[PDB]
Design a protein around this ligand. Structure first.
Ligand SMILES: Cc1cccc(CNC(=O)N[C@H](CC(C)C)C(=O)NO)c1
Ligand SMILES: [Mg+2]
Ligand SMILES: [Mg+2]
Ligand SMILES: [Mg+2]
Ligand SMILES: [Zn+2]
Length: 890
């Protein structure tokens, strides 16, 4: 395989200053004419001029109006256009090409493609080369003049980046529009859209310079009614970047556009952000609650890239985390601010410690700045994004808000209009650190290990209290497991946000403080500690690590009830559940393997259950928080703690724990389910697509979590409640009625009822598909076949394929059926999908990432299917690299 290495970065021998494009859309072809105004750089050594260009049909090639001929002045192999050096000018020159491409058959959704009746582009990372020839790498920055032409009836709205400088008619019922983007950019930020689009618009006035910006949001006509919340979230995003970061938008217009067929969430093309419709479009009668959160985060994310990615871009793709990690951190800050609910930060932590920790213990483990790749696309990972965000967030923890803001401003100004590297960011943060420490010898050189070292650190603690001296010590150790990336792991700079709780009264004993652990181990000592405390460690989840608190369950319960920090409270609960899960798992496992006729199970701690009841009954405690405490840890979290995991044993473990707690709490759960109804399902704001009450949404979440618990329990007459719930105007509620009815004969009636409610809205139907797919049904395999035949059919829409299959893959009992039939079904979907969309096929590989954590029969079955996929003729480079890495061959 062709391997690119971070250390081998070199600047190009060429410069592209201006790009002038004419994109002429017709029914069965698009013609792209492109002039590149180029020059020779100071790094040039008279090399051949090599352009990326994939799947292009060449009409003509010229340099300075001299036609070039295949075999004589150039070669083209369908991937690279090579202009022999004799024909490459030695000073400024014009390169012209005209190629033909076919969006109407581009089902890979990269380059220029058709999504329903909209023509749209996706260029990040390597898509621009599928539109026209270029030196397709992010350090090749240029200014763009783009003309789009098309049939006017079919494609009345034409957009590209930047200012629309002209619009004109063309004979034969066509028309054109010309765009000028004045900001230098890499080609990955180019976009064009053509469609029969409708819009909502508003004018935003910037805070400092009072610049008028016209905001447009666009969709197909059918769904124009679903654009309003996106527009509001854009206004919120713009205000937040002004208010926190002092950053103002930099063009007269910003367009956001929803398309039905999109590989991921959205894309930050300058002035022309393009979204998966599931991440831009909602209405309260037609969307579940989680859509509102998702749109807020994704709009925010793309908007924040306008500085972190666009105005300051990447030197090379190994720097991906510099824009994605930093943008996710900005997006998280924004979301926390907008929602004002503690469950926001918790949700980010839950995702990291489940999916990202799994990745980091897998054969796919990489540092947030990888050292190599074959397909850069396989590095758009939860590591690069979510661990990257936690690495970006630790700078804020270490510096505090004022000095963090200073460092960020150093970075953003210094590198404006240019490329940057992770080192540039660390250098800016290090300038702030020196100022904070008032010591120009302080440095953050150790911090760089967070970019280069893979794997999750393990941090463990020991405590000692001397009552005569009123003196308390916290001794801390860190360990990272050696791996394929580093055989010897070095200690990191780990910030440990800490409090100390008095167990006698539940109160805070110290000003919160941040311990800076820089060695493999260290002991932090506190004086004037009046009684033995219970430590409150890694407040806010202050570093991306495995925490071993070495606390008793009695101490954990005291923190769950009385600590101030939502993460420590949640983590203390998590830890009590993990101790129980591992103990019961081992009990069940021994019983199974020893074929015992009788055995014991350790009961769930009765004081913990009493604590759960106390919190649930507190009318002043948070509804969202409550929903986390009655839920066991996610399976992907649990599996980080078990080797050779028997998934059936784990399923039996979780069922036993849930049943123990419900046997004590179900009546509490029912009383709460009823008592929360009035406030949860209040219709204030039901017609207001500009405002969401996130606390009220967390109440619905709690109700729906409780309803699931009671339904699984067969609580008496709960079917009555399920049927009433299916009549609620909130889709979150009526789709929950379908999933919780899985435990009853009424499931197929609710399946039909909710289908009819869902089938006329593309996105609501996809949410119905997910609801069916995750249903806890013994007959799930026959239900999947019914979805395939009756609803999915031949769809190539990634959202339809993902909706049908991914939730089902999280069904611990059924997906991991010891026959292997679950593994076979998903492997067939992967292979099928790879024939037209390699990026989506690699997404669908997700359940296989934990293969080497499973018991040896399941390991063998997963491995069999992975190797079968690898044998498929014409397997994509994306899928083949992924699977070779995952199976320890690469
Ligand atoms: C964790 C993670 C891995 C890969 C991709 C994503 C995010 N979904 C997106 O929409 N990502 C895009 C990538 C573009 C190249 C489409 C993004 O970062 N938009 O800013 C998450
Ligand atoms: Mg082609
Ligand atoms: Mg997010
Ligand atoms: Mg469709
Ligand atoms: Zn992004």
């Amino acid at each position: 395989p062709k391997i690119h290495y971070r250390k081998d970065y070199k600047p190009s021998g060429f410069i592209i200053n201006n790009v002038t494009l004419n994109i002429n859309i017709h029914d069965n072809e698009t013609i792209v004419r492109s002039v590149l105004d180029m020059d020779i750089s100071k790094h040039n050594v008279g090399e051949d001029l090599v352009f990326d260009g994939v799947g292009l049909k060449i009409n003509e090639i010229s340099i300075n109006n001299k036609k070039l001929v295949e075999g004589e002045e150039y070669t083209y192999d369908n991937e690279f256009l090579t202009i022999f050096s004799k024909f490459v000018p030695k000073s400024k020159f014009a390169f012209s090409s005209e190629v033909i491409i076919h969006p109407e058959t581009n089902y890979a959704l990269t380059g220029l493609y058709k999504s329903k009746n909209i023509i749209v582009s996706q260029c990040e990372a390597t898509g621009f080369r599928r539109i026209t020839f270029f030196i397709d790498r992010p350090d090749m920055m240029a200014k763009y003049d783009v003309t789009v032409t098309a049939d006017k009836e079919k494609y009345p709205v034409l957009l590209s980046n930047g200012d629309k400088v002209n619009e004109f008619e063309i004979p034969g019922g066509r028309h054109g529009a010309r765009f000028n983007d004045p900001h230098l950019k890499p080609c990955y930020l180019f976009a064009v859209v053509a469609g029969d689009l409708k819009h909502l618009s508003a004018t935003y006035i910037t805070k400092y310079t009072k610049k008028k910006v016209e905001l447009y949001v666009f969709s197909e006509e059918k769904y124009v009614s679903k654009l309003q919340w996106a527009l509001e979230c854009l206004k919120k995003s713009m205000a937040f970047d002004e208010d926190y970061f002092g950053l103002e938008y930099d063009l007269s217009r910003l367009n956001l556009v929803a398309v039905s067929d999109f590989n991921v969430g959205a894309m930050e093309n300058k002035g022309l952000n393009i979204f998966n419709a599931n991440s831009l479009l909602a209405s309260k009668k037609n969307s579940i609650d989680f859509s509102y959160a998702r749109i807020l985060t994704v709009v925010g994310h793309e908007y924040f890239h306008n500085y972190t990615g666009n105005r300051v871009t990447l030197r090379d793709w190994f720097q991906l985390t510099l824009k994605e990690g930093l943008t996710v951190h900005r997006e998280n800050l924004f979301s926390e601010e907008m929602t004002k609910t503690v469950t926001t930060r918790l949700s980010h932590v839950d995702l990291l410690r489940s999916v990202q920790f799994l990745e980091d213990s897998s054969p796919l483990s990489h540092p947030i700045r990888p050292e190599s790749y074959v397909s850069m696309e396989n590095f758009y990972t939860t590591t690069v994004y979510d661990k990257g965000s936690e690495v970006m967030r630790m700078y804020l923890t270490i510096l505090g808000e004022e000095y963090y803001k200073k460092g960020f401003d150093i970075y953003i100004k210094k590198n404006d209009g240019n490329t940057a590297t992770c080192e540039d960011f660390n250098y800016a943060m290090e300038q702030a650190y020196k100022m904070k420490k008032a010591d120009n010898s302080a440095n953050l050189n150790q911090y760089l290990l967070w970019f280069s070292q893979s794997g999750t650190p393990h941090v463990s603690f020991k405590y000692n209290y001397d009552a005569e001296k009123k003196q308390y010590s916290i001794h801390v150790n860190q360990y990272t497991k050696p791996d394929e990336n580093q055989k010897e792991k070095k200690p990191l700079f780990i910030p440990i946000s800490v409090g100390l709780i008095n167990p006698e009264n539940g109160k805070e004993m110290i000003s919160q403080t941040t311990l800076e652990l820089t060695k493999e181990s260290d002991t932090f000592v506190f004086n004037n500690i009046a009684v033995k405390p219970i430590p409150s460690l890694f407040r806010g989840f202050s570093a991306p690590v495995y925490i071993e608190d070495n606390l008793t369950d009695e101490e954990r319960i005291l923190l769950l009830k009385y600590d101030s920090d939502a993460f420590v409270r949640y983590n203390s609960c998590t830890n009590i559940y993990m101790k129980q899960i591992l103990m019961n798992y081992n009990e069940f496992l021994k019983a199974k393997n020893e074929k015992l006729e009788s055995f014991n199970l350790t009961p769930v701690n009765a004081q913990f259950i009493d604590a759960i009841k106390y919190l649930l009954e507190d009318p002043h405690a948070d509804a969202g928080f409550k929903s986390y405490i009655v839920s066991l840890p996610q399976d992907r979290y649990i599996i980080n703690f078990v080797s050779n995991l028997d998934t059936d044993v784990l399923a039996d473990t979780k069922e036993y724990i849930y049943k123990q707690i419900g046997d004590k709490l179900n009546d509490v759960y029912y009383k709460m389910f009823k008592s929360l109804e009035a406030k949860a399902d209040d219709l204030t704001y039901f017609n207001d697509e500009s405002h969401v009450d996130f606390d009220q949404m967390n109440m619905r979440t709690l109700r729906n979590t409780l309803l699931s618990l009671l339904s699984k329990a067969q609580y008496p007459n709960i079917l009555n409640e399920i049927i009433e719930h299916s009549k609620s105007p909130y889709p979150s509620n009526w789709l929950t009625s379908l999933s919780v009815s899985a435990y009853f004969d009424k499931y197929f009636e609710l399946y039909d009822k909710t289908y009819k409610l869902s089938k006329d809205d593309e996105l609501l139907l996809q949410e119905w598909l997910k609801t069916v797919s995750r249903s806890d049904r013994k007959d799930i395999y026959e239900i999947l076949k019914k979805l395939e035949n009756e609803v999915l059919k031949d769809s190539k829409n990634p959202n339809d394929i993902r909706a049908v299959y991914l939730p089902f893959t999280n069904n611990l009992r059924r997906f991991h059926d010891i026959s292997g039939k679950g593994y076979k079904l998903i492997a067939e979907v992967i292979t099928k999908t790879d024939k037209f969309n390699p990026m989506v096929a690699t997404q669908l590989c997700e359940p296989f990432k934990l293969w080497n954590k499973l018991d040896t029969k399941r390991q063998e079955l997963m491995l069999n299917e992975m190797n079968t996929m690898l044998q498929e003729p014409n397997i994509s480079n994306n899928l083949k690299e992924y699977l070779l890495r995952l199976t320890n061959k690469l």
